Amino acid sequence: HKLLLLGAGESGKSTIFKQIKLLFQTGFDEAELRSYTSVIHANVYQTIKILYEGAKELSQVESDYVISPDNQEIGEKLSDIDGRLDYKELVLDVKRLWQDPAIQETYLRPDCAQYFMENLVRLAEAGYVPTKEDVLYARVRTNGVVQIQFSPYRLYDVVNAVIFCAAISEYDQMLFEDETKNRMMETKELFDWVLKQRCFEKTSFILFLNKFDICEKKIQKVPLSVCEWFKDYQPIEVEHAYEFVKKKFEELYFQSSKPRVFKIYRTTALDQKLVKKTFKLIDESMRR
Ligand SMILES: Nc1nc2c(ncn2[C@@H]2O[C@H](COP(=O)(O)OP(=O)(O)O)[C@@H](O)[C@H]2O)c(=O)[nH]1
Ligand SMILES: [Mg+2]
């Protein structure tokens, strides 16, 4: 019955966790969405907060990002909020907070947050219930362990099965935390390190290759050979490049060869019913 979620950075494991929550019951789902609006509101408020803080700092350190002077008085009420406690007047402020191009070139430097910036007025009014997409895009800092038991059987996010989330699209990107390191390389480092440890030998392994939609969008412009792991790559399309990444993920797994159980899944975490399928396939596969 046991499943554990392991990933690196923005692997999407919490998103998998979230939409398994919307998909399965976990009957209430009350107002689950309704309890989650406070969260959603929060990211709206600290997103334009970090956006505002950026523009001024970069303006001080770089020869100009200049804000509109009349905005500062409504602009720093933002800093006056501080999220003291779970927080249409604010949407009129925030839209009228945004208009300077400065803070969007600081933006054009969290991809989910821009969505929220496209849906304020729907969130504004009292008759608001978040869509399923609002829940998925909502960012909740994961504190501790989260247990969910449900039957179509507990899922953990921070054991009979380890779901490893590898965001194949991250091959372009360096680490957000470390500009030197590459996230695909850190995924390989993490994946290898998890495979080597003696505490998950008994555990069955399921691998998710996430953010595939970004992969099909991005592959046609940036070569996959940028990655040192994928430097071997030379095209003839999308399916082959994806299966190429599989090869690497395969051969990497099998080199940890001691004289059991392995599965790989093509996943998009931000859409659901692609994902329902994935769970259907592994829960029927989890025989014995
Ligand atoms: N395009 C796309 N983005 C995703 C998907 N899953 C997650 N994300 C992005 O990843 C971020 C959140 O990842 P998260 O679940 O927190 O990864 P975690 O920190 O390892 O749990 C969000 O900004 C999403 O936009 C996906 O299937 N497709
Ligand atoms: Mg997470």
Numbering used by the authors: 40 to 103, 107 to 129, 134 to 155, 162 to 204, 215 to 220, 237 to 314, 320 to 342, 347 to 375
Question: What's in the article?
Answer:
To avoid response saturation by active Gα proteins, faster deactivation is achieved with the help of GTPase activity accelerating proteins (GAP), such as the regulator of G-protein signaling (RGS), which binds to activated Gα to accelerate GTP-hydrolysis. The two domains of the Gα—the Ras-like domain and the helical domain (HD)—flank the guanine nucleotide binding site.
In comparison, the OsRGA1·GDP complex structure highlights how changes in the active site following GTP hydrolysis result in large-scale conformational change. Within the active site of the OsRGA1·GDP complex, interactions with the guanine ring and ribose of GDP are comparable to GTPγS bound in SmGPA, even with substitution of Tyr189 in OsRGA1 for the corresponding His186 of SmGPA. In the OsRGA1·GDP structure, Thr194 (Thr191 in SmGPA) lacks an interaction partner and the catalytically critical Arg191 guanidino side-chain (Arg188 in SmGPA) points away from the active site. Of the four OsRGA1 molecules in the asymmetric unit, three lacked electron density for residues corresponding to α8.
